[PDB]
Nucleic acid binder design. Structure first.
Lengths: 66, 88, 117, 97
RNA sequence: UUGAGUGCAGAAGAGGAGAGUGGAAUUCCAUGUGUAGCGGUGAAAUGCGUAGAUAUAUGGAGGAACACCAGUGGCGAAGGCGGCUCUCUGGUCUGUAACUGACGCUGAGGCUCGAAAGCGUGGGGAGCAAACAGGAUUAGAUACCCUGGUAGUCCACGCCGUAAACGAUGAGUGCUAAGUGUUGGAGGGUUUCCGCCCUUCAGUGCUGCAGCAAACGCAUUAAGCACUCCGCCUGGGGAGU
């Protein structure tokens, strides 16, 4: 009964879709685990590598506490 | 490893007859080109230990097939080792 | 003097001492206060009893130079910052930003030995 | 087959107008001059950055699509020329799926 | 052709090496602001500070390790492997069957790999810290406690080849009730399937019949019923001398 992103077939994360990607981060700048969102297994790894690419090109800072 | 282009080259210019993709005369030439390329990789990178185990397994299996074929027809065996360039 | 009148205070605390300093928005310093500097000795500097009077001895010298608003910055999580803020409100300040920035690594260097006690 | 290598490289916002086209066309030459085959190399987005690099908290992104076999040498040559420059800040080369 | 292998179609993955790169945090240096303490303990002391410390903002230098993701999750023959981008390259699973036609398994001698600590040659030191110095505790303390501090920990190239290297359970195959999670698949019912339900493959946990066991316990990932091959044992010390 838990949340997911597999209904809308975003089959490739596109490395740029950072406005949809805001679902899976937090205020402090961390990652919600799969215990939180209830997403898929391999989808979690894809999103994880995706946002680690995204943290490098100025699309999300590491530290956001200001 | 090898691409399917040179793979499908050598599995058909060395096959016995039509439909042969088993036929242990084929597999030894396939393994021969594979272990030559892996030998060149081991010469380039000389501490990739986890692929050298695969070299050991391939050369052992080619040895088993090569010693199989000699216990059936020594003439085919001689023709291949005069043809494929091995057995020092 | 110059009556800057809008600054940030800094609360730095250990497990055996604490230091409060009220600074500017830079923060260039106005006045600091230390639990050892107010006559305490030994282990008593851990308790927030020194935090209240350290905040008082800071704010007196602070608003002699003119001071209205203040922001809170917290380091070194222990006992001091729990009562330093509410004692800092007591001598007439305008606390409006409370943050707890901790110097946190991402496993850079090594911590020392454990204590076999 | 070949591959597909995105290059999403950060362009300074304080360049002149011919500087943009001259720089994009020059790096399109150095990809074309060593056998690699570019397809669609456009500008992407003026954007403010999440944090600075030196003082640039804003920038203009870019995107290309080059296809080439792995046996060439321009891609690492593009890396060497990109790191010695200043006007391009950060680039990342990601295989396309 | 049933075992054993290459087809063609896919899939997952901290598998390995080589080359670059990212930010935070510590330490040092510079600058401004700012004065009498900072640091440590059960309690103190050694120590650093008016040659301006600690603290707070700005930069500059360098090394090491990769915060959340992270899960009884994954990979590998084991030792082991977690930031990111790229080149070479090893291995496993699922379908299917045209193709080879018993080509297999185990394997004394031999070879290869093999955590930390250690040795040689040449680099670098951010922390941490054997040896050592000082303070403290004690009847005494060549320790536990606090302040410092070298070799080392890192990289490249050679050497040694050990561990509580453990699931303290050698390897190959077949057979013998269930229930429940979870990783990766294939098929069917249904379908915005992304959910769900049924069938089936390879791992991976947890609970429990028969059966075994001196007990504890194990139990389709057997320590059950068996066959093939290898290693080892025969009271404790003396002594892995």
């Amino acid at each position: 009964k838990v949340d997911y992103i597999a209904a809308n077939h975003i089959e490739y994360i596109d490395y740029k879709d950072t406005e949809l990607l805001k679902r899976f981060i937090s205020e402090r700048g961390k990652i919600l685990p799969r215990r939180v969102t209830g997403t898929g297994a391999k989808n979690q790894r894809k999103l994880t590598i995706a946002i680690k690419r995204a943290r490098i090109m100025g699309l999300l800072p590491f530290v956001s506490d200001e | 490893a090898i691409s399917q282009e040179r793979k499908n080259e050598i599995i058909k210019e060395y096959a016995r007859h039509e439909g042969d993709t088993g036929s242990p005369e084929v597999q030894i030439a396939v393994l021969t080109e594979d272990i030559n390329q892996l030998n060149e990789h081991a010469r380039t990178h000389k501490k990739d230990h986890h692929s050298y185990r695969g070299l050991m397994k391939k050369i052992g299996h080619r040895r088993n097939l090569l010693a199989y074929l000699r216990k059936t027809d020594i003439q085919r065996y001689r023709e291949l080792i005069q043809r494929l360039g091995l057995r020092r | 003097k110059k009556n800057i009148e809008s600054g940030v205070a800094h609360i730095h605390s250990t497990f055996n001492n604490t230091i409060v300093m009220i600074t500017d928005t830079h923060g260039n310093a106005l006045a600091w206060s230390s639990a050892g500097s107010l006559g305490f000795k030994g282990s008593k500097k851990s308790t927030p009893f020194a935090a209240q009077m350290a905040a008082e001895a800071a704010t007196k010298v602070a608003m002699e130079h003119g001071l209205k608003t203040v922001d809170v910055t917290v380091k070194g999580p222990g006992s001091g910052r729990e009562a330093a803020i509410r004692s800092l409100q007591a001598t007439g300040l305008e606390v409006t930003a409370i943050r707890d920035v901790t110097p946190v690594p991402h496993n850079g260097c090594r911590p020392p030995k454990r204590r076999r006690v | 087959q070949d591959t597909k290598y995105e290059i999403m490289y950060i362009i300074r916002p304080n360049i002149d107008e011919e500087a943009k086209t001259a720089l994009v066309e020059r790096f399109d030459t150095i990809l074309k001059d060593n056998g690699a085959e570019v397809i669609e190399s456009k500008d992407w987005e003026k954007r403010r950055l999440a944090y600075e690099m030196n003082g640039f908290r804003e920038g203009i992104y870019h995107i290309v699509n080059v296809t080439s076999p792995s046996t060439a040498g321009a891609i690492n040559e593009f890396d060497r020329l990109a790191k010695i420059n200043d006007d391009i800040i950060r680039h990342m080369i990601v295989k396309v799926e």
